[PDB]
Amino acid sequence: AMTNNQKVKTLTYSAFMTAFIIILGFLPGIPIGFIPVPIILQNMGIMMAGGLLGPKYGTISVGAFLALALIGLPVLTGGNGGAASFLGPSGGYRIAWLFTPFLIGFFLKKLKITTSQNWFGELIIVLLFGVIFVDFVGAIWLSFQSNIPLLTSLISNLVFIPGDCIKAILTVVIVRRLRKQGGFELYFR
Ligand SMILES: CCCCCCCCCO[C@@H]1O[C@H](CO)[C@@H](O)[C@H](O)[C@H]1O
Ligand SMILES: CCCCCCCCCO[C@@H]1O[C@H](CO)[C@@H](O)[C@H](O)[C@H]1O
Ligand SMILES: CCCCCCCCCO[C@@H]1O[C@H](CO)[C@@H](O)[C@H](O)[C@H]1O
């Protein structure tokens, strides 16, 4: 049961995480040829949320970001948003983002990664849930909503892997540094 100081801290950090995800969206996306889904930076913030704030508050932070997009603020990459855009080609990735911080936070906590020097374990958890889970759900949704063969969608999504691996690596480096003091231990009890 948090103290007032802990709850003010949690509000501050959660608000920062939501704002950070939004700021990453100020970079324009890079269109690729073969599918109507760009390379972006914003999914990195989604990856970091669960490793900093754990499975509850990480999810709330991402949820708040997504809620802002759903009601119409242009907080997605390139100044996009609105509820209708969630039924579009990139909808699957976005829905997967809501679950990513829960999954990452849950396994970091359960495998005690946050209390160890096992940064490679952390990287694998981030890869599994922030990269593979996200890109797979995204690829399936894309196949259905753009009426393209599933095999084509899955293969085309390999284009995202190099950039997504870099994001996952930077995620582990950044979050482990932020955690080393003090300070985020509350979220992984
Ligand atoms: C710089 C571009 C605009 C940035 C907008 C930042 C929005 C920050 C909102 O975050 C949310 O605030 C809620 C209370 O307001 C918290 O309950 C919640 O945990 C947190 O996720
Ligand atoms: C905008 C939607 C916000 C949804 C809020 C997410 C609720 C977080 C649930 O807590 C988690 O429950 C798990 C099992 O129930 C525990 O294993 C874990 O330790 C705990 O952190
Ligand atoms: C002042 C700029 C930052 C916030 C200002 C309020 C903007 C609210 C509505 O914006 C609109 O959002 C749509 C998505 O819902 C976009 O499709 C559209 O291009 C954009 O015009």
Ligand SMILES: O=C(O)CCCC[C@@H]1SC[C@@H]2NC(=O)N[C@@H]21
């Ligand atoms: O703003 C949107 O509409 C969502 C775009 C989703 C892009 C996905 S996220 C995972 C993969 N890696 C990228 O760089 N882009 C795609």
